[PDB]
Amino acid sequence: FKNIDGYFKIYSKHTPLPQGFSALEPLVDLPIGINITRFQTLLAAYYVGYLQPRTFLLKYNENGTITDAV
Amino acid sequence: STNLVKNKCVNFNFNGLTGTGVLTESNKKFLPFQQFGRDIADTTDAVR
């Protein structure tokens, strides 16, 4: 999940934290804009990692999918 | 909107972006969220 000029993007994937690569296709984008400085969860165990502006080198394979990154 | 012509150099206009070239059936596997192929030179190589 991320927010840029209010636009709220979501990406996800069904992977059946292990190794390997599995790029997250977007599913929804909410174009309204909320000033967000919190996060919660309603309903087990889960994981959380934050994001930084980090230049990446993406390896699109021949079928067009991100199969590896740097 | 007009009809679609393949195998001929045409002056196409998809969703407001102009261009010129031959349109063909592509086997590229666009994922449901992608609408454009792109070249090394930021040239639209394929479209939806």
Binding site: Y11, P18, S22, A23, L24, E25, P26, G49 | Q35
Partner: peptide, 23 residues
């Protein structure tokens, strides 16, 4: 607690198809 993110968090940055290119 804590865990290591091995190679996770990779997502398609834009809605532009690309192929055999190291973008």
């Amino acid at each position: 607690a804590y865990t290591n993110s091995f190679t996770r968090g990779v997502y398609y940055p834009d809605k532009v198809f690309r192929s055999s290119v190291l973008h």
